[PDB]
Design an enzyme around this catalytic site. Structure first.
Site, PDB file in Angstrom:
ATOM      1  N   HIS A   1       5.283  -4.362  12.323  1.00  0.00           N
ATOM      2  CA  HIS A   1       5.689  -3.302  13.247  1.00  0.00           C
ATOM      3  C   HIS A   1       5.668  -3.812  14.681  1.00  0.00           C
ATOM      4  CE1 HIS A   1       5.613  -0.686   9.873  1.00  0.00           C
ATOM      5  NE2 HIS A   1       4.300  -0.528   9.817  1.00  0.00           N
TER       6      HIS A   1
ATOM      7  N   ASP B   1       0.721  -4.567   6.999  1.00  0.00           N
ATOM      8  CA  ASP B   1      -0.079  -3.757   7.926  1.00  0.00           C
ATOM      9  C   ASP B   1      -1.470  -4.300   8.232  1.00  0.00           C
ATOM     10  OD1 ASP B   1       2.101  -2.243   8.231  1.00  0.00           O
ATOM     11  OD2 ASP B   1       1.227  -0.337   7.579  1.00  0.00           O
TER      12      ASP B   1
ATOM     13  N   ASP C   1       5.443   4.779   4.956  1.00  0.00           N
ATOM     14  CA  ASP C   1       6.461   3.895   5.514  1.00  0.00           C
ATOM     15  C   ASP C   1       6.612   2.602   4.718  1.00  0.00           C
ATOM     16  OD1 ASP C   1       3.839   3.705   6.673  1.00  0.00           O
ATOM     17  OD2 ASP C   1       4.574   2.130   8.025  1.00  0.00           O
ATOM     18  N   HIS C   2       5.924   2.512   3.573  1.00  0.00           N
ATOM     19  CA  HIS C   2       6.039   1.353   2.687  1.00  0.00           C
ATOM     20  C   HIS C   2       6.430   1.715   1.252  1.00  0.00           C
ATOM     21  CE1 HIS C   2       4.326  -1.359   5.784  1.00  0.00           C
ATOM     22  NE2 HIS C   2       3.842  -0.202   6.203  1.00  0.00           N
TER      23      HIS C   2
ATOM     24  N   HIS D   1      -7.142  -1.882   6.373  1.00  0.00           N
ATOM     25  CA  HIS D   1      -6.138  -0.940   6.827  1.00  0.00           C
ATOM     26  C   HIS D   1      -6.006   0.132   5.753  1.00  0.00           C
ATOM     27  CE1 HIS D   1      -2.460   0.649   8.496  1.00  0.00           C
ATOM     28  NE2 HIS D   1      -1.877   0.507   7.316  1.00  0.00           N
TER      29      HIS D   1
ATOM     30  N   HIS E   1       0.856  -1.191   0.000  1.00  0.00           N
ATOM     31  CA  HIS E   1       0.000   0.000   0.000  1.00  0.00           C
ATOM     32  C   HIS E   1       0.892   1.241   0.000  1.00  0.00           C
ATOM     33  CE1 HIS E   1       1.027  -0.400   4.189  1.00  0.00           C
ATOM     34  NE2 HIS E   1       0.164   0.491   4.647  1.00  0.00           N
TER      35      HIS E   1
HETATM   36 ZN   LIG Z   1      -0.026   1.361   6.696  1.00  0.00          ZN
HETATM   37 ZN   LIG Z   2       3.110   0.558   8.077  1.00  0.00          ZN
END
Ligand SMILES: [Zn+2]
Ligand SMILES: [Zn+2]
Ligand SMILES: [Cl-]
Ligand SMILES: [Cl-]
Ligand SMILES: [Zn+2]
Ligand SMILES: [Zn+2]
Lengths: 273, 273
Positions: free
Chosen positions: A251, A206, A99-100, A184, A95
């Protein structure tokens, strides 16, 4: 050659416990790791996700207190393996939360793949999604739509930042399956990697931040559809059971410290014969 | 006789700032008021919501640190006006989170109204909704379905805790409109009260906890559909504009201190003629 998985350690970020565990918490700062998944496969080198960009987080989300050393950038992490971005053939994004996808800018040569809905979502997100989708350096088109062309690395064009959109559960390569786990985000993907001689790994990404998240069906506070989010957790629970797959979370610091990163990898030869 | 609105002050609860302002916060304990809305109307006395039950919160959610004095129970608040629960003809619930239905048990004689989807939701909520829908003393049926019959006040039956289910925007009485504002919960209702000689009041209830919530489209972290939640905030913004209505929020301490409670009311005669 046999499938190997290398985890690229991308440093860490901080959120409140209430961000990590929607409504349950407890509150207070929680530091969590961010990583990307490199698959060395017969069919090519596939990189799933590209971590966060440090300058982006420090400019737009400084409250997340990023820690990321030079070997924890994507080029730095690839360097530990004697690789460079040019060595990656295909980049897949689970996605487009920042942070990806913060390292996508380094792969103009690569084929890019994501869920069909994710590029349009980055172009026009729900109002409560703007900060998640805040790094548009992965797409000239999305950057333009969001007024963020200043984020673009020099040399980035629509031509070299175009994605092939996919939908449903689909095979990326032999024994590599993208598992649709929306909620998400609108087009969130998890990842199932099968090996010739060890059990599959299901990377939740996620869809489940931590082991505790899955165990309690308590998803992250960042989501677009929490009903979908729970149903995707159930899909993940079942798929892992049905496959005897081992679960790895996105995470989860405690678990991450047990994960192989850097030159250590998954998919060793067995020396049985 | 002319429509009057009395706000029944129901004491207060505490959540984290991250609960109140989904993902934005800031974090830390925030104390917020809980109130119910009594309408003295030509057609009857209508009570919209019934606050929280103190013993329920102390048993199930003690971390919300309830403060509620004897005049802040529903019978206590009605007593300030020289009334008793038997004086109320109709109870309407915006939704069945515990802080809006904790006093229903006192109104077995009353007609009960709620969104058609809300009783079934209380019977079988999403896993992440169990704590919001944790007081089932308002419904013998829901209590039975949730294994919570021990919560029932003596004398409560299916017969006297049956709701008339409604849907869409509907008139409760002349100049009293229930405004469908789903998202926070599946069948959440806001309330519009029109008067003969002052401007309408739009009670947002949980569609918007605070003025800041509306201004920023930052809803509460408790929700079932945050896309619906934002769209309902927009519906509320517009309806207030279109009606010249004055906005009153559910869980906004700063604003609540400016609101009339107790023997003070909205809908005074003007002495103009
Ligand atoms: Zn995310
Ligand atoms: Zn993330
Ligand atoms: Cl191995
Ligand atoms: Cl008045
Ligand atoms: Zn509520
Ligand atoms: Zn409430």
């Amino acid at each position: 050659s046999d499938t190997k998985v290398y985890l690229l350690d991308g440093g860490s970020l901080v959120l409140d416990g209430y961000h990590v565990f929607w409504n349950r918490g407890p509150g207070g700062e929680v530091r969590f790791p961010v990583y990307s998944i490199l698959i060395e496969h017969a069919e090519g080198r596939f990189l799933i996700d590209t971590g966060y960009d440090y300058d982006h987080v420090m400019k737009v989300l400084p409250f997340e207190k990023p820690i990321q050393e030079k070997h924890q950038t994507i080029p730095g992490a690839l360097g530990l393996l004697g690789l460079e971005p040019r060595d990656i053939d295909v980049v897949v994004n689970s996605h487009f939360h920042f942070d990806h996808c913060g390292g996508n800018k380094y792969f103009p040569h690569a084929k890019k793949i994501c869920h069909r809905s994710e590029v349009p979502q980055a172009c026009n997100p729900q109002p409560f999604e703007h900060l998640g989708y805040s790094d548009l350096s992965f797409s000239a088109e999305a950057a333009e739509a969001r007024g963020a062309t200043a984020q673009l690395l020099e040399g980035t064009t629509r031509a070299n930042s175009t994605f092939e959109g996919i939908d449903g559960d689909v095979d990326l390569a032999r024994g590599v399956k993208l598992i649709s786990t929306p909620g998400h985000s609108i087009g969130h993907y998890s990842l199932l990697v099968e090996f010739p001689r060890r059990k599959p790994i299901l990377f939740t990404i996620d869809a489940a931040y931590t082991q505790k998240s899955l165990e309690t069906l308590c998803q992250a506070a960042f989501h677009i559809d929490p009903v979908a989010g729970v149903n995707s957790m159930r899909k993940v629970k079942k798929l892992a059971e049905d496959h005897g797959a081992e679960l790895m979370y996105s995470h989860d610091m405690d678990n991450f410290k047990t994960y192989r990163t850097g030159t250590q990898f998954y998919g060793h030869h067995h020396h049985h014969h």
